[PDB]
């Protein structure tokens, strides 16, 4: 359709790098809808020209930042999301974190209604806000950003408004709780091992949640092979990280360097 | 129901029982109405049987089911409990469990209800549900068992697979998380339990630690810590479990 988008946001430059590779990935997949990415004038001018060129739009937005919460202090400015409401443009999108990664074609997701998401792993009646189906608008965007501005985030961030505005979620209409094959975390592989040896062929996005971002390894190419010194507790699945390595070396790094 | 729902456990040694102990009193406690059943295998100490009866209403002896975390094996000794058609409906609640509040509510739902598992929350943990007992149910999860086996080697995984449709069908079987809320949950999203937190009614010390585990001084009221410990984040459920333990099991232990 072409009222119809994937949305995602980066507020700098290395998160640019994720939503290079989230842009290929739906791409690679055949996504018959368009691409949009919401950037912040800390996006380096060279990196939105490059942004361009993958995503249909790019949207400069300001950045919105919860600020110093004693809740990662880096993730104030994840509020940033809130934006996506705004893109009226299009009756339905998909909101997708930079950190995201699609495995096959997800546009099957567009037959869902505001808000759906997938369970957030650890406390499972709050979704988890990196992929999300909503409905742009702008009596919802200006509630948002009221909640946002009175009540603040009860974790500091993008995911804990979400859930206090959207709060009927976990026990409203199932059709809403995105099955986990749209939402799948590294940390979820570790918890339930024999669940993903069973389900995981089935995964259709993978999402790098946590501190430590594909961008912040260092990869060797000739050994396909992945390191960094800074631990991940989430044990980043490698077969995924080689993954969105391989698209990145390929596909997007000759635009960079 | 005052003679015909029950909260239903299973120990299959020593060790487990002192968790059943602290579950049954906890369910006590808290007034239910219900009866209190254990499921106990040989393994558990005549003694110990003897112990468990002055708590439960009723100790039932059943046999080990071992698919072949290895000592989770025998978790599907579990599926015994839909044998226990004196019942028209249950709550089953590991010996991993304790109750802070009533939850007599569930007797609402219908089979199968349960929590989120907070690894893989399409799945149900299988450490609180709500079901039926049923000779037909019983016999189909038996053939199951032997048959295919269980995904995870343990009573989760066919549980999950025989009620299938639990993810996607009738939101009505979904508890709210606080009817099972693991403290690994407590610590892997803080913020979400320091604002819904203070309504849980059940906590679920899952994972291979358990309180019973634990070195406890009664003096102090402290537990020796682990070199990392996601319990002593938020404590309080532990030394309820080991205060619990201290003042209402440990008398009846001797
Ligand atoms: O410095 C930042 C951090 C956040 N993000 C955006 O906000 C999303 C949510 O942050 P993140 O994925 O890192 O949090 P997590 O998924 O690990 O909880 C990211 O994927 C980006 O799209 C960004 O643009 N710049
Ligand atoms: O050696 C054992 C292991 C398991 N159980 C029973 O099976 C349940 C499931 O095991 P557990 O709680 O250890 O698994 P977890 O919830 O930690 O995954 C226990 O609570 C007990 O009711 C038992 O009686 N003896
Ligand atoms: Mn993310
Ligand atoms: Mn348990």
């Given at each position: 359709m072409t009222d119809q988008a994937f949305v995602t946001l980066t507020?700098?430059?290395?998160?640019?790098?994720?939503?290079?590779?989230?842009?290929?990935?739906?791409?690679?997949?055949?996504?018959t809808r368009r691409l949009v990415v919401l950037a912040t004038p800390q996006v380096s001018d060279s990196m939105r020209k490059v942004l361009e060129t993958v995503f249909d739009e790019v949207?400069?937005?300001?950045?919105?930042?919860?600020?110093?919460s004693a809740h990662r202090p880096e993730l104030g400015?994840?509020?940033?999301?809130?934006?996506?409401?705004?893109?009226?443009?299009?009756?339905?999108?998909?909101?997708?974190?930079?950190?995201?990664?699609?495995?096959?074609?997800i546009d099957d997701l567009?037959?869902?209604?505001?808000?759906?998401?997938?369970?957030?792993?650890?406390?499972?009646?709050?979704?988890?806000?990196?992929?999300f189906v909503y409905q742009?608008?702008?009596?919802?965007?200006?509630?948002?950003?009221?909640?946002?501005?009175?009540q603040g985030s009860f974790d500091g961030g993008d995911q804990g408004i979400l859930n206090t505005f959207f709060s009927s979620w976990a026990t409203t209409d199932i059709r809403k709780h995105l099955?986990?094959?749209?939402?799948?975390?590294?940390?979820?592989?570790?918890?339930?091992?024999?669940?993903?040896?069973?389900?995981?062929?089935?995964?259709?996005?993978?999402?790098?949640?946590?501190r430590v971002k594909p961008w912040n390894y260092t990869y060797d190419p000739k050994t396909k092979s992945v390191k960094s010194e800074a631990h991940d507790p989430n044990m980043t699945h490698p077969e995924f990280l080689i993954l969105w390595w391989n698209i990145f070396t390929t596909n997007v790094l000759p635009l960079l360097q």
């Amino acid at each position: 359709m072409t009222d119809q988008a994937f949305v995602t946001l980066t507020t700098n430059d290395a998160y640019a790098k994720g939503a290079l590779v989230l842009g290929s990935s739906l791409k690679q997949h055949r996504t018959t809808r368009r691409l949009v990415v919401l950037a912040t004038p800390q996006v380096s001018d060279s990196m939105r020209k490059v942004l361009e060129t993958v995503f249909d739009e790019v949207i400069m937005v300001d950045v919105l930042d919860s600020g110093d919460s004693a809740h990662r202090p880096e993730l104030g400015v994840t509020l940033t999301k809130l934006h996506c409401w705004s893109l009226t443009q299009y009756s339905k999108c998909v909101f997708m974190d930079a950190d995201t990664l699609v495995l096959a074609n997800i546009d099957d997701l567009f037959d869902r209604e505001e808000l759906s998401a997938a369970p957030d792993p650890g406390w499972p009646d709050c979704f988890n806000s990196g992929v999300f189906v909503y409905q742009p608008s702008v009596e919802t965007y200006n509630q948002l950003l009221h909640l946002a501005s009175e009540q603040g985030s009860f974790d500091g961030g993008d995911q804990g408004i979400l859930n206090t505005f959207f709060s009927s979620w976990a026990t409203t209409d199932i059709r809403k709780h995105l099955p986990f094959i749209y939402n799948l975390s590294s940390i979820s592989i570790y918890s339930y091992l024999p669940a993903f040896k069973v389900f995981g062929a089935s995964a259709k996005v993978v999402h790098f949640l946590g501190r430590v971002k594909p961008w912040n390894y260092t990869y060797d190419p000739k050994t396909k092979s992945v390191k960094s010194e800074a631990h991940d507790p989430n044990m980043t699945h490698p077969e995924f990280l080689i993954l969105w390595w391989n698209i990145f070396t390929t596909n997007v790094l000759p635009l960079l360097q």
